[PDB]
Amino acid sequence: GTHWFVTQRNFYEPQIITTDNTFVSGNCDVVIGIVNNTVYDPLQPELDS
């Protein structure tokens, strides 16, 4: 309703949208119905130790 998750199609198991749950292909002007949100990189938070 407010947040976006990625889930398997046959069972609602919401997951945080990461760069390892998704793949990048193209630009943000060709997909009809695309939305804005943040893709969490699992590596940025821990590289700054």
Ligand X SMILES: *[C@@H]1O[C@H](CO)[C@@H](O)[C@H](O)[C@H]1NC(C)=O
Which range, of 1-9, 18-26, 40-48, touches ligand X by CB under 6 A?
Answer: 1-9
**# chain residues binding ligand X, by CB under 6 A:** 4
Return the HEC string of 26-46: CCCCCCCCCCCCCCECCCHHH
Residue 26 binding ligand X, by CB under 6 A = no
Interface with ligand X (CB under 6 A): 1-3, 36
Interface with a second copy (CB under 8 A): 13, 25, 43, 46-47
